[PDB]
Design a protein around this ligand. Structure first.
Ligand SMILES: O=C(Nc1ccc2c(c1)N(S(=O)(=O)c1ccc(F)cc1)C[C@H](CO)O2)c1c(F)cccc1Cl
Length: 226
């Protein structure tokens, strides 16, 4: 709405993000050295489809709850009706989860942090979702090339959540106000750090819609006759 409350907004969001991320970037980097041995990997591959789905679904659910907390710490979010909160939370929450998981990825050897160590795609063999796992790893790789700072992720994902072009909203104009403020903050921050160039190199989303839709499709296959 004005200057200096804009910077207050930026630091507000970055603070909320710092307090709602599962692991801190310091520790994810620190443990890049720590890799799953072949015994451990094949250990994960010998799990049944249903054990593996249970584990990953749990991890996913945990991640999503952390994103829900993040949303609650954004100014204006709690003053929305329960409905709009829910809508925004569906779409946004899983998408935000995928960006943060970009944080958890290591492009040097194409491994991701999982249950304490780094490992490649081969773990998730037990899931029986080769194409989806591939898509996830590719997305994280390309985002990893952009070198997001924690602040850039904070603001980007806040913008992913607070989208007033989600179909189903009742108080569309309140969400548009929150969105507008957040876009303003994001762009001012990028200019002050001279990172605005990255606005061209953002992932076209609908690539993100593809990951979500893929999760839905594979869930539909999974629960079909079992
Ligand atoms: O596992 C599935 N989806 C999923 C998406 C995002 C996630 C997670 C899971 N988890 S995770 O388990 O730790 C994880 C999974 C795959 C990775 F490559 C790295 C990490 C948490 C992570 C928090 O940073 O964000 C999945 C999937 F990919 C296919 C079918 C069913 C499921 Cl549940």
């Amino acid at each position: 709405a004005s200057l200096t409350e804009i910077e207050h907004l930026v630091q507000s969001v970055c603070k909320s993000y710092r307090e709602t991320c599962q692991l801190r970037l310091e520790d994810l980097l620190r443990q890049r050295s720590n890799i799953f041995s072949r015994e451990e990997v094949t250990g994960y591959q010998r799990k049944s489809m249903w054990e593996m789905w249970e584990r990953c679904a749990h991890h996913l659910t945990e991640a999503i709850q952390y994103v829900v907390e993040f949303a609650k710490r954004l100014s204006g979010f709690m003053e929305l009706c329960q409905n709009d909160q829910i809508v925004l939370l569906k779409a946004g929450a899983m998408e935000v989860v995928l960006v943060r998981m970009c944080r958890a990825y290591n492009a040097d050897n194409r491994t991701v942090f999982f249950e304490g160590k780094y490992g490649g795609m081969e773990l998730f063999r037990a899931l029986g979702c080769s194409e989806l796992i591939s898509s996830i790893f590719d997305f994280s790789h390309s985002l990893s090339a952009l070198h997001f700072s924690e602040d850039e992720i904070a603001l980007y994902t806040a913008l992913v959540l607070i989208n007033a072009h989600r179909p189903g909203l009742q108080e569309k104009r309140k969400v548009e106000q929150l969105q507008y403020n957040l876009e303003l903050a994001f762009h001012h921050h990028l200019c002050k750090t001279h990172r605005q160039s990255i606005l061209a190199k953002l992932p076209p989303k609908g690539k993100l819609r593809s990951l979500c839709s893929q999760h839905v499709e594979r869930l539909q296959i999974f629960q079909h006759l079992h």
